[model samples]
Each structure stands twice: as structure tokens, then as C-alpha cells.
Target: DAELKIFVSSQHQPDIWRKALDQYEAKTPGVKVVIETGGNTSEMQAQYLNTVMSAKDSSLDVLMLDVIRPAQFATAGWTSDFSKDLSAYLPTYAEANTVNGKIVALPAFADSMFLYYRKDLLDKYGIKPPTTWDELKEASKKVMEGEKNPELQGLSFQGKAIEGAVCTFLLPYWSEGKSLVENGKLNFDNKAAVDSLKLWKSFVDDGISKKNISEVATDDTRKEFQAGKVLFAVNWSYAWTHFQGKESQVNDKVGVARLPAVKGGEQTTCLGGWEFGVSAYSKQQDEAKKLVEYLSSQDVSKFMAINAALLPTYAALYKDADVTKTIPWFADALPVVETAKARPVTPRYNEVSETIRTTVNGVLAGVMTPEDGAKQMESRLRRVLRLEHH
Candidate 1:
């Protein structure tokens, strides 16, 4: 009969989760639920860690966390062990939230980036959505040169040294079929990895992308594309509403497709999304777990998919007609989700991620050669992850 207090991340829409809470309370009588939001990934982690370190119990019942930071919290014993038969309640349990053989988090709303393009521009230029990195480069050049509007850039994406830039660029790097490290060794020296960095740089050097791009944050990049200043944009599903809205200059002319591949490489999209978890120090773990279940249920996921245009973590929600109609990009985005790959599941994933982000940023800024950047990243990653050399 205790109140369920949940501390959600600002990244999520509180209203949606509040609706889920309402349903949860209705089903389980004598339970009151309180919802709080407004913390980004790092903030959420700090809040939870501070509570645990201070030995404060019941300060937070439910915690919303990003996929990247869960491992750190789990390793620090800040999260509860949900390893017991959680699959029936959360089907994507093993894939998204399990850390170190324990299901410590629940997948909430999942998102992956897609290539959004101006269909009319592509049609006029006799170009198609590119399927390979080489084709993407060629098509981008054609779009920039052939378009009458000099203000229109060939491609736009997050280039800021923030977490988003790292995630957005990871798709292209991974699509090259190489990682920051592979087989317990530093593999950034791989030709594919170097080539990927070079290819990203070419976008800026060849005039396809602007030099000021590295300063654009994720929102700014999306805004540029919606304003018709960019021919192609890479962004998450959340931007669908803004880009398709009536105020958008490129509305109705825009299209969405899976990210293109590297030559001789397979298509892969990097998965990025938030997850919900019950804190180990919470006094209301049972009620908090109920809220998590209710929020992540198939029905709630489908509702959010239709109303908020969010990509659902539940695979079953893809078949809903209303949901499909609201997100026109769903038809093309479905396969992308099916093949979506998450970043490494290691406990030191944040460190691993930073290595990639720092190296790529250096290369893009012209401060480091791709070879040197990759070598530095690989060296740092091996030390951070403590991977045994083969």
C-alpha cells in the first residue's frame, strides 16, 4: 500500500509514463505512484550513484538510464538483479538490458538512426538513396553540384563531440565491419577502420558537408535538414514529428531509409535508447517493478509508437495499423530494427565509447591522422577493457 516513487530521465516524456502509471495503479489497488523527470544520462547515473553511496534507502524507486551507462551502475551494485525469468515480462530482456549475465534493466523506448533525404531532390538529380558508402559519396556529390540551391548541403549529421555524434558516426564505422577493437586486440589499425575515418573526413573535404558541421549538435542538424538546407540527414526517429510537421519547409518532400553500407560490407544500424530499472536501494521495488512492466508492456509501447511516433522496443507493436500509419517511415525502418546492433555490452563501455569518440573527433578536426587516432584509441581501449591479447 506504499506509494511508488519513480525518477525518470528528462530524455523521456513524463506524460507517457504517467499514463502507464495510471494504468498500473488501477490494476493494483492501494498503490500510489509518483513520477519525476529531468535528468540526462550522466545526471541520472550521478543521482542514482549518489543515493547509493550515501546509503539513502527509498530515495528513488525507479531509475531511467541510458543503455551505455547501465553497466557501470550494475557493476557498482547500484541496480537490482532481475535475472529470474524476466523474459516473459520483457521479451527483449536479454538483448537490451542484461549486463554481466544479470537482467538489471528493462528496455523502454528504443531508437536507431535512419538516413532522411529529400525525395524530390533525389528524383530531380536522377539519384536514389544510397545503399553503400561509395554510392552515398557519389550521390552526395551529385546532389551538391546539381541542385540549384547553393545553400543546400549534400549531407548533414551530428558532428559535435557529444554522445550523439559518437552514436551517429558509429553506424558508419561499424557498417565498415570493423570496431574500435576486435578479437581482444587493437584492431583500429585495420584498413577498414582507417578507410571509414577517411570516408567521414571526405564528406567535409569534398564540400559535401560544411566545415562548421562539427559544431552542430543533434537538434541543430535536424533543424537544418527540416529547413531544406540539407539534402540528406542522419537522425533518430524522434525528429520525425518535427521534420514532417506543416511548419517544416521540407515536409512531404522528405523521405526516410536505412543507413547506407560500406562497400563489401553489410548494412547495420547502431541501437541507441533508454531503459528503465528498479534501484537496489529502493524501498518500493515491487511497485517500481510493476510500473516498469506496465510502461514497457506491448500495449504501452504500441500507444507510444502511434502517439509520440517513437520506435517501439516491442517487436509485436510493428503490426498495428494505426501505429504504422502514423509513422510512414515504419515500412522502411522495420528491417533496420530487425538488424539493429547495440554497442559493446562490456562493463567499461563508456570508456570504450569515449575512445572511439575522441579518436574520431581528433581525425575530423585534422589534429590526428586516422592511423594515429585509431592506434591511440585501440591502445586506450585495450587498457580500459583489460582485454587479453591474442
Candidate 2:
């Protein structure tokens, strides 16, 4: 029997994947699936994968990639081309996996930043879920006043220099109808960037977010939200399972909604998720591709959704009876996930992400004014991208 090795991140629940792999091995008589897990963050995982791919190592046959990596990996010739038709998957996922009209990866699951609020508290105070940033602030103040709980935070989100901060910065920027990159080039906006940064800083200035929010990371926000110390949180789908866990204080009291927009802007949220890529250096390319096909199939997508609470990449799975029964929020999450925008895809993506996330943290921490932060971001990005001529 031929064995195929796959690299998976510990952050994405490898135990559930092992269950699926066991099933696949039982059905496919001539193949064995091996799992190697290590990375805990997106950045850490990318560093390891980049090293492996650069050396053309054949130790790993399949790779689990962040959604933003397909384009960069395809450009670097690290991932093999997939001839499989991705037309049946969600439109957003299909678009993310394709580069230059060729499929470079297949979607493993989908995610988007959502407004997770305490449904019980909102109903208690007669406030509907907010549609605009101003409305959200007013609602937060009203709830805090009524509850009189000094420990309760109105909103919890990532503000530290982490990958999620990149999304935190982009959410309001995209809401203003601006994009970080256009046609593979920098499309930075000065005013939109300033306003977006100011918006988040205002939350802290007004006490909606905590004073030390600048130090908060993704899991830090999740822990606060799960402990019932947060009234609203902007987070990924992963938090839903933890929020509903046995020890959670806010279990069964949460509701999710689309992220609030700026006053004159449309609602837009950041997209985040994982994808499957067959390694170009694999000894058994055909076998690895076969495994990816089954991993990204509708059956496995639905299985992850039901068992591990991972969002599905298939549109039909959102409406599947069993899936809906397991994750009732999937119906509401579908629209947000479909409309969310993927981060900029570039080979210089690491530098781009560092500039954006650090600038965001600086602004939130008050180390720099929003105006200065926005200007710094533009200058740094221009230099790194060699856009000085433009």
C-alpha cells in the first residue's frame, strides 16, 4: 500500500480530520493517510511550508493552506494545478482557489468575521442587532447602563499585531468601498484608512472595548467572549463551538449577525478559511490529488460542519437538513461568508500583512494618530512593492 502524508495545522482541529482520514483509509484499500501537525498560527505555518516548498521536499504530499496562500503558492510553483471543476462550491471559495483561470487549490472550509452578540442581553434591553457602527455604539452604551456590570465589555476583537489585526483594519476599509489591492497592485486609500483606524480607536476611547485591547489577540478575545465578559465580539466561526461548550458562561445566549458598517458605507466583513493544495514535489502526485478530492468533497465538508463545527464550502451544505440541525446558525452565516472579501494575494504578502497589522496596532495603542498611521502604511507598502514610481 502507498502512503500519503499531509500537513495540517493544530489550530484547525486535526482530531476530527483523523476521523475522516480513518474512514477514507477503510474505503480505499491501497492507500494510507498520515498526519503531521505542528503550527499553531497562520504565520508560523507559512514559515514551515515555505521552507518545505522552497527545498522541493517530497516528505509531504498534500498541504493545508490558508485561503490567501493559493495565489502566492501558485505563483511560486509550489502547488500543482487542479483540473477538478470547482463550479459546484461557493462562489467566494471558487474565486479564491483559482489563479490565472486555473484551480490551484480546493476549499477545505469557509469562515468570515461575524458580529457575535449576547442575544439574551439584547432582548432584555429591547435593542435589535446593530446595522451601523454608530448604532452599535449606542446599543453598547444602553446595555452597559442597564446591566450595571462593570466587568462586561461591549465589544471584543483582535487589536494586537497578529494576523487577525489585518482583518480588523480591512473590515472598515472595505466597508467604505475601498480595497487594499486592485489588479495586483497597491490601491491604498488615505482617508478611508484613517477613518477605519479611528473607528476602532474610538471604541476603546469610549470604553466599549477594554483599555488594554491593544494587547488582545484572537484567542484572547474568544476567551473573554466565552467567559460572559463581552456583550459583542467580532470573531470567526471557531468561537461558536467554544461559546457553546459545557463550561462556557454565555452558552445558548449568543446570536450572530453581519458586521456593522460605517454610516455611509455598505456592510462588509473579512474572509478567512483553509484550503487543500497538492504539493508539486509529491512522489505520488495522482494519489495526493485523489486524497484532496475526497477531502474537499461534499461528504467530508458536511461531516466537518456537523462534527467539528467547521463552516462548509459548499452552498448546498448550508441548507442540508442534518447540517442545519447541528449548526443552526449556518443559515444566517451563509450570506456573510458569501459576501466577505479575501485578503490581498501577493508573493510579498508577508510584508504587506506585517505593515497593515502593525500599523493597525499602533493606531489602536495610540502610539500614532490615525492620519500618521495611514500615511505610514502607504509609504511602507509603496517602498516594499517598489511602487515609488507610481
The best candidate by lDDT is: 2
Error of 1 at 98 (Å): 2.2
Q: What is the lDDT of residue 290 in candidate 2?
A: 91
Report, for all candidates in order, the number of backbone clashes: 1, 0
Please write out the lDDT profile of model 2 over residues 235-353, one tens digit for every residue: 98878888887769997899988999999898999989889999999999999999999999999999888887789999889899998887798966788888898788766777878
Report lDDT (CA) for all predictions: 0.72, 0.88
lDDT of 1 by residue, 61-144 (tens): 887777676777677777787655545432443466766678788777777788888998899888979988678778888877
In model 1, what is the error at residue 6, expressed in angstroms?
A: 3.6
Worst 10 residues of 1 by lDDT: 85-94
Stretches of candidate 2 above 4 Å error? 384-390
> With candidate 1 superimposed using the best TM-score fit, by how many Å does residue 258's alpha carbon deviate from the native?
1.3
RMSD of each: 3.4, 2.2
